[PDB]
């Protein structure tokens, strides 16, 4: 009834582990650091991405300059589901002053079969906080003049670089 992952940093060292427990039609997701000093204090975006690969200095499926864990692709969507929040979006990881963290959250947005389908999936911790695409259109505009969030914000939450990654399965 469970999937797991061990998340590593770009240099290959272990950062955290995750459990995905499926029961009663939903997932209970637990993630916690395995030591100290490996994440910056504060809030970090946490999402499931659409390809089960955790390769430092890699290229995204549709192209771009290489970067950490980019071959994991974009946010995970259950087939036939578009828009925000993506199926793979999770509550943020709150990191204490010593770099340690623990989160439990729940979601009915995906199943075990979903995560094991196809190219599999990866859980990613971002460098920055997730804005959940909440950019008040009455008070903020894009630099082109359009009110509210742009496509990049809608699909990423502007959480920045990928600082830890684990493939979801049995690891």
Minimum distance between the CB of residue 51 and a second copy, rounded to whole angstroms?
23
Minimum distance between the CB of residue 76 and a second copy, rounded to whole angstroms?
15
47 is in an annotated binding site: yes
77 is in an annotated binding site: no
Rounded CA gap, 117 and 110, in Å? 11
CB-CB contact of 64 with 122 (8 Å): no
For a second copy, the binding residue among 104, 117, 118, 161 (CB under 8 A) is: 104
CB-CB contact of 106 with 26 (8 Å): yes
Closer residue to Cu ion (CB): 38 or 47: 47
Rounded CA gap, 40 and 163, in Å? 10
Return the number of other C-beta atoms located less than 10 Å from residue 3's C-beta.
21
Is 36 a residue that touches a second copy (CB under 8 A)?
no
Match 């469970």 to its residue by tokens: 2
Is 132 a residue that touches a second copy (CB under 8 A)?
yes
Q: Which does 106 bind (CB under 5 to 8 A by kind): a second copy, Cu ion, none?
A: a second copy
Minimum distance between the CB of residue 83 and Cu ion, rounded to whole angstroms?
16
Give the CA distances from residue 50 to residues 43, 70, 95, in Å, rounded to whole numbers and listed in that order: 22, 11, 25
126 is in an annotated binding site: yes
DSSP letters of 50-85?
Answer: SS----TTB--TT--S-BTTGGG-SB---TT--SSS
Q: Which does 141 bind (CB under 5 to 8 A by kind): a second copy, Cu ion, none?
A: a second copy
For a second copy, the binding residue among 37, 65, 97, 170 (CB under 8 A) is: 97
Q: Which does 124 bind (CB under 5 to 8 A by kind): Cu ion, a second copy, none?
A: Cu ion
Q: Binding site for Cu cation: residue ranges?
A: 47, 49, 75, 126
């Amino acid at each position: 009834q469970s999937l797991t992952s061990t998340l590593t940093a770009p240099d290959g060292t272990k950062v955290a582990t995750a459990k995905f427990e499926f029961a009663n039609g939903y997932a209970t997701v637990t993630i916690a650091t395995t030591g100290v000093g490996k994440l910056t204090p504060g809030f970090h975006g946490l999402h499931i991405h659409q390809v089960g690969k955790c390769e430092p200095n890699s290229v995204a499926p549709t192209g771009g300059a290489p970067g950490n864990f980019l071959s994991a692709g974009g946010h995970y969507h259950v087939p036939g589901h578009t828009g925000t929040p993506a199926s793979g979006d999770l509550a943020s990881l709150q990191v204490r002053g010593d770099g340690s963290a623990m989160l439990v959250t729940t979601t009915d947005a995906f199943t075990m079969d979903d995560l094991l389908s196809g190219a599999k999936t990866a859980i990613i911790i971002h460098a920055g906080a997730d804005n959940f695409a909440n950019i008040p259109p009455e008070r903020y505009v894009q630099v082109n003049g359009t009110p509210g969030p742009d496509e990049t914000t809608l699909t990423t939450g502007d959480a920045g670089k990928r600082v830890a990654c684990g493939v979801i399965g049995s690891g």
